[PDB]
Amino acid sequence: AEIVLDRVTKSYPAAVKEFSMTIADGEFIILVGPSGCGKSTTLNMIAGLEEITSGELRIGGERVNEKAPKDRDIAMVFQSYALYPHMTVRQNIAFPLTLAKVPKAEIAAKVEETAKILDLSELLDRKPGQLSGGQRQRVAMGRAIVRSPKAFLMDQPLSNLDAKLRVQMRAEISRLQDRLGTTTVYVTHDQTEAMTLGDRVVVMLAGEVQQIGTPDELYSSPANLFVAGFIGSPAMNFFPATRTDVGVRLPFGEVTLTPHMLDLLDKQARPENIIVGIRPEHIEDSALLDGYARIRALTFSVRADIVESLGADKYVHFTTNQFIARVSADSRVRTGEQIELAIDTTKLSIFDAATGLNLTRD
Amino acid sequence: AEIVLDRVTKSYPAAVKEFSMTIADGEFIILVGPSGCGKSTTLNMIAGLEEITSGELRIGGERVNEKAPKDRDIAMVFQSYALYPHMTVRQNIAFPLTLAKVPKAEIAAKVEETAKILDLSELLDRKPGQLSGGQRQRVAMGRAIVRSPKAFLMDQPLSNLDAKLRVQMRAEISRLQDRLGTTTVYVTHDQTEAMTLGDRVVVMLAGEVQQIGTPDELYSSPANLFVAGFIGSPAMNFFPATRTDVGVRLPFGEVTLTPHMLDLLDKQARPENIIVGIRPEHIEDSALLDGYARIRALTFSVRADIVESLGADKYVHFTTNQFIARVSADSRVRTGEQIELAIDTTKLSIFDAATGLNLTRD
Amino acid sequence: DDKKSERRLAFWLIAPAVLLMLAVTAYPIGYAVWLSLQRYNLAEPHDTEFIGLANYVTVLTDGYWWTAFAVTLGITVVSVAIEFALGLALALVMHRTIFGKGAVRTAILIPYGIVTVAASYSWYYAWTPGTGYLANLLPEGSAPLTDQLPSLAIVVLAEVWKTTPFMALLLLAGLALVPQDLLNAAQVDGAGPWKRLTKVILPMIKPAILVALLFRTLDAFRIFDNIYILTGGSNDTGSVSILGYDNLFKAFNVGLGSAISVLIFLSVAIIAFIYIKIFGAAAPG
Amino acid sequence: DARRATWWSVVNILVIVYALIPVLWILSLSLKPTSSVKDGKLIPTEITFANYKAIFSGDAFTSALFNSIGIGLITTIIAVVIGGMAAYAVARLQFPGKQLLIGVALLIAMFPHISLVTPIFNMWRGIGLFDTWPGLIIPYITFALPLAIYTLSAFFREIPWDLEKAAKMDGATPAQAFRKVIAPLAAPGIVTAAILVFIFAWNDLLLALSLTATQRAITAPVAIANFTGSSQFEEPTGSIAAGAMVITIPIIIFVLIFQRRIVAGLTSGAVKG
Amino acid sequence: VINYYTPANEEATFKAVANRCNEQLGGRFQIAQRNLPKGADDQRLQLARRLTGNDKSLDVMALDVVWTAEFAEAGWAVPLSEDPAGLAEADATENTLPGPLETARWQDELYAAPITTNTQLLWYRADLMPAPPTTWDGMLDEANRLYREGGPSWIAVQGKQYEGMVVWFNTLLQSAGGQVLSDDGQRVTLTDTPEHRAATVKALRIIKSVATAPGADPSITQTDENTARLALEQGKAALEVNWPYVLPSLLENAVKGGVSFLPLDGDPALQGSINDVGTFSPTDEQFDIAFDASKKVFGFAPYPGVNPDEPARVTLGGLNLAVASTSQHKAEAFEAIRCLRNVENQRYTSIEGGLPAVRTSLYDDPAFQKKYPQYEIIRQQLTNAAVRPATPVYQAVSTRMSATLAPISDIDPERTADELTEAVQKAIDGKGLIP
Ligand SMILES: Nc1ncnc2c1ncn2[C@@H]1O[C@H](COP(=O)(O)OP(=O)(O)OP(=O)(O)O)[C@@H](O)[C@H]1O
Ligand SMILES: Nc1ncnc2c1ncn2[C@@H]1O[C@H](COP(=O)(O)OP(=O)(O)OP(=O)(O)O)[C@@H](O)[C@H]1O
Ligand SMILES: OC[C@H]1O[C@H](O[C@H]2O[C@H](CO)[C@@H](O)[C@H](O)[C@H]2O)[C@H](O)[C@@H](O)[C@@H]1O
Ligand SMILES: [Mg+2]
Ligand SMILES: [Mg+2]
């Protein structure tokens, strides 16, 4: 149901701050936060575990807190794996369902279909301990896929699998939830899974949330200059700047463009110190089209020596420090300062250090 | 030193069946492969654990295949963490230092510098039961980084960490090994971290190795038709073909007419069930001048209706099966009859069935 | 190497244990069987020679031994069976506590250190018509010690109360091993407070009950103290250990006391065999 | 949270009453004069302490309580230490834990002690120290070993295997994995075989009843049985069931010391990925 | 040096006597008492396992009177006629009460010298009974008449399934002729001739109608002698037969409120004392007034017989001394044993001891009657005293003769005679398993 987490907080002899937000039914939500940022603790709390300290949580219109974890019909896939060592995998998958409607003419098909889904149907003999990581993970995930509860709570559910297994699980994990079944709280810091699956993503840091938008409203218009420099693993590099509205600045350069976005920046008294926030995916090599049909694309890149290959398209360690730009595969460069680039000066994230709310979009 | 594995078979029915290769000093060997193909078993058989059945390991001028694992001087990080749940993180990292050489004036600073490296200085005196998952991972890596040992072995040492911290950790690991570390085997699945660290990768499926080439000659020119569908994450080789050396068609039209290497391609002279295997990172929209600053690169005029908008580099699913294609962000696309897809006909690497090598680069 | 480097350690590791266990117990066992091989009386020493299995065939062909056997067995299989079911609850209250910081955790363990004679006289005085804190609670002139069945009831109660801190300690020590994440996932997977037990917490300690279900049903099989000090043989209630005491110490009939000791060594070894075979996972395997 | 604090305060007295009222009746017998020992009345009237000053008459009970408080704290130590070696070698090792050592350590303890006493008596007669601690200690240890073997060989093989692996990797010789790796995790597995051995060798009266002669090593549970109040055929309830309230002091201040190492859930080193 | 062993129940008196014969007597050779446990059968087991080992020690030792000589039938305790031309048989029976000189002979010679004797005798509440019964068939008849009151009809005996049962049954057996085994140690003369059988069935019918008496109730099947000494002290018993300790017991107990319904609050002379565990030695005057106050409600009489005033030949007890055969030197033991039972030793052992001593004419002087005012009767209970059955093995036959009598209730007199006799036979021939 509509899980309304109104001002939740845990403490320790400090782990989450006021988590005021809601999660409607049917839609996803994907937490993401650097490392130890009240993330698995939020799931432990919204489950029956980790009794709250602030004093509010409402699964649906109810007032369900300090209640037994059993009476909240919530499934879970922990960061760790329970994976009861004495049972086999058949029983590990049938456990949460056999404490439910019993008839054995149901489990016999259920623990077979939900094991062919995760590609395990051939491995229904061994017991945990005789299984590798990419199999224990799948079994732990199946133990919550098989439940069909009123809420799926997957906590880093697919961490160590291969690429094609991951791209098939990301398919059959939403091709399953789309029928019905949950307001799921997915947890992952993968930067592709939080963009292809969630209907509403959530970035957080040390408890406090930052942005609760959609997987595109964050890549395009990020607020508070941290989700800005966080999502998009080749993180948006940050050049300094001066106030100078019309032509703002560059580390080596001042001429800029796009007055079509200063109509609202007109009303600003922000400190003159300004971060310009250019994402690397917007840069090209000027030896391709000079940016656009218009030759002028601010040919500025000079010093690049660390050209990491990465196959599909390579990364130049752009230095005017320690910036990164990405150029295409056929780019004829190998540790040579002949890579005068072309940035796109119609889209970029002006910012400042104090409040960093320079989103100024929509 | 020089770890020379020769036909290291293990099974208990199975496991890795035939593993024959060498690892000289200095270079990594980043093992990759799908879940349940045997990587952890390989690292264990290298470290002595899980005694090999019919193999002959070798390290330097001897045959260390039955010696005690204690007598090899080999650090390790497991899939699991194997963290001592009572020793506070301080002693938990200082443990290997408290086994052979114990000058406390040195141990009190080595562990401090190490905890500074891995961003653990704050949560340094705590027991690994009140830590997070990422922090447990970083501590299990810290227990192996501060040893200056005779060799390395790492088994997904950064599985659950944000990309931001992940890239810094990868750069630091590269620096450390650049100082000195021999045979830093590195089992990992994130394709973006198997092409920037490993100076040589080993793709394997069900024990048997596939290729031991550099991570450039692996993505550019794949072998055995599997290391093409496994690396290069959104890979695609679903296209059938029908050879007509001058006129050879495709499910869309004339594509492959490349006499500058077609000589070897015809020298192959193999069954007519060949596969072209066109990457997704080269199918494009109708924006750039086609061919190579030209036209008639077979604009596909595809009719699919599936778009994934992760970031500013979208993926279109096109079937008219289940093909995929990278597309620049500027192409305003939707779920209707839409963009004519143009493919550059210079990077094809045509495959063939019933033998499944068709390397076509030699 | 490792094969040699582990057994060369293990032999010198178990050397003192088995060495001491064979230095002062092999010859006594051999002598206790020798005394069974042939008639022997301490009242007339060296007045006897080899007789064979006469002692065995005469102890198996009486009625005074099957009676002392169908009582010790009928007491063991009802004392340990209730002791386990009560020790589970006692260990749970002893482990899931919030105030049991030595408050209950040791007040549940002092009733095991009380010496057996000073703790059997307590029950013998407790149940006497006229004298005893509870014997007066019964109706006028009850005396539940003169008749058979109430005597068996009180002799099994004085064993339950005595040895409950022996299987309310192993089922706790071997229960503090169960990791928290397992019980946590059992909790979140739709399992109450009982369905958790026998499903996720019990099959883990299955090698921790094999020590509290195999080292009790030996001692509670050779019950001698709480049945001799407490109505030692009235109306055919004597156990088998009292029958091995009477015919050996207070009769000097060694040639038969040794046979009656071996005849319960065998009958308890069959129980140990059945228990080791029924549990699978055990001490050696 | 009074809900889980009233149930847990009633089921915290309905045990400390059940397991205490006999150890209150023994006290009531111990604190009564020799005229009202047999009128019931669990709460004693006219309480006096003649029984304790009676048992403590010069050099009667002190030399039999020292000879036990200083023999238990030796049999426990030497039966856990060398009784843990074979346990660690049968649990975490391959060959020695055969069906021979186990099949012998299973028959040793279970054999009835009654028929076994006289051979040990006539052995210790002319072989060495018959009526002192080493003559009394060795049988205690030899009959307590199987307990301290089956209580450690079942809690020394429930340590997660990856912990042993991580101990091997760092280069820890087996004299250090047993000291800093596998021991503190089995702290609730050692303080449960260092208490049972103590309670077994502290209140048994089948061996020390015949294998002891004089004030030199006459233990308490046997110098507490042969008491004479005033007449031959009588039970000095002022000295039996009233010296137990003194012999139970160490078995209180020992459990109260070793109940700390029984700490709740202690291991977080599991799969976690 | 000679180191005689004595039970721990009466050991301080023997320590003082050992002193008075080792240090007070000339410096010939010292003596000690390295005692042995008080289990009363544990002691026999310990002595047996010591003498079997042939350990050259344990010169002289104290053995109970029931181990007449069957202890020394294989040669454990040396006879007296094998003295080093000493005075063994000339002093151990020069003149000693005709009773305890029977419980030391084996067949035709003595193997020991008795030091302590003990005889049962009725203890009746002199308050409400001026006619102490002298016939068992009238002894329970008195209680039947007395049934009007609720609890004085409790006949208190010692009939628990232990040595008490046989030591109370043998009195009644021999009080009408016949011996359990025989005048020797080969046969079982219990029911052979009708003369013998005319008595066993009446003994069984008197030991049945007292336990199924109109006033007697349960707790009489599991009653040893302690219940028999405490039923009279509580106030719910009128007849009870016990050893001669109960008079000192009552006179030192009923001071502390545990009275037999006589007031005996305690004169402020001894009440003015906080006397330690032992409440003895009030300079004999508080003792005098206490006994005089207990005179009217505490009466005794010679043991109640079954025959027409042929007094019941009681079954005596005590403790004898014997020189062991496990000593390569024994002359010193034979010399010291007769200095351990002499005038002063055997005077002290009862004057300020517990066990009634035995001498030629000790029981007939003002030097003895100051402690045992039942001496005029205890010196006659020791002449026609029916010893416990002479046997080459005792510990076996008794735990079968009492096992047959374990459920006293419903013994059905006329039946169980044959079962008891065949049980004794199976005990005496060596065939069967002891229960
Ligand atoms: N048992 C504990 N005792 C004290 N502090 C704790 C404990 N468990 C967690 N914390 C605190 O909370 C943090 C863990 O929060 P959370 O569960 O969200 O982390 P996580 O999601 O596992 O981390 P990550 O994904 O970065 O690995 C720790 O870094 C610590 O600051
Ligand atoms: N203890 C065991 N007993 C029997 N078979 C086992 C055992 N452990 C592993 N296996 C077999 O090995 C297979 C996995 O091989 P291995 O452990 O080498 O893979 P891995 O490379 O660690 O896996 P992944 O790549 O998914 O992390 C299992 O599917 C199983 O069949
Ligand atoms: O501690 C009292 C309980 O244990 C007793 O165990 C003793 O007797 C056993 C044989 O009968 C011996 O094996 C053991 O060594 C003794 O300690 C007894 O078994 C129980 O009846 C007591 O309740
Ligand atoms: Mg986490
Ligand atoms: Mg693996």
From TrEMBL, chains A, B:
ATP 3 binds at Y12, S35, G36, G38, K39, S40, T41, G133, G134, Q135. Its main location: membrane. Residues 3-231 form the ABC transporter domain. ATP 6 binds at Y12, K39, S40, T41, Q79, Q130, G134, Q135, H189. ATP 4 binds at Y12, S35, G36, G38, S40, T41. It is found in: Cell inner membrane. SUPFAM superfamilies: MOP-like, P-loop containing nucleoside triphosphate hydrolases. ATP 2 binds at Y12, G36, C37, G38, K39, S40, T41, Q79, R126, S132, G133, G134, Q135. Monomer. Homodimerizes in the presence of ATP. The complex is composed of two ATP-binding proteins (SugC), two transmembrane proteins (SugA and SugB) and a solute-binding protein (LpqY). This is Trehalose import ATP-binding protein SugC. The lineage of its organism: Bacteria, Bacillati, Actinomycetota, Actinomycetes, Mycobacteriales.
UniProtKB/TrEMBL annotation, chain C:
The keyword Membrane applies. Keywords: Membrane, Sugar transport, Transmembrane, Transmembrane helix, Transport. Residues 69-275 form the ABC transmembrane type-1 domain. Coiled coil: none annotated. GO terms for cellular component: plasma membrane. It comes from the Bacteria. It is found in: Cell membrane; Membrane. The chain crosses the membrane at residues 9-34, 64-94, 106-126, 152-179, 254-276. Its main location: membrane. GO terms for biological process: transmembrane transport. Pfam families: BPD_transp_1. It is a multi-pass membrane protein. InterPro entries: MetI-like, MetI-like_sf, Sugar_ABC_transporter. Belongs to the binding-protein-dependent transport system permease family. This is ABC sugar transporter, permease component. It comes from Mycolicibacterium smegmatis (strain ATCC 700084 / mc(2)155).
TrEMBL record, chain D:
It is found in: Cell membrane. It is a multi-pass membrane protein. InterPro entries: BP-dep_ABC_trans_perm, MetI-like, MetI-like_sf. Gene3D superfamilies: MetI-like. One of its GO terms (cellular component) is plasma membrane. Keywords: Cell membrane, Membrane, Transmembrane, Transmembrane helix, Transport. The chain crosses the membrane at residues 7-27, 65-88, 100-124, 136-156, 177-202, 240-258. GO terms for biological process: transmembrane transport. Residues 65-258 form the ABC transmembrane type-1 domain. It comes from the Bacteria. Belongs to the binding-protein-dependent transport system permease family. This is ABC transporter, permease protein SugB. It comes from Mycolicibacterium smegmatis (strain ATCC 700084 / mc(2)155) (Mycobacterium smegmatis).
UniProtKB/TrEMBL annotation, chain E:
Keywords: Signal, Transport. One of its GO terms (biological process) is maltose transport. InterPro entries: SBP (IPR006059). GO terms for cellular component: ATP-binding cassette (ABC) transporter complex, substrate-binding subunit-containing. GO terms for molecular function: maltose binding. Belongs to the bacterial solute-binding protein 1 family. This is Bacterial extracellular solute-binding protein. It comes from Mycolicibacterium smegmatis (strain ATCC 700084 / mc(2)155). The lineage of its organism: Bacteria, Bacillati, Actinomycetota, Actinomycetes, Mycobacteriales.
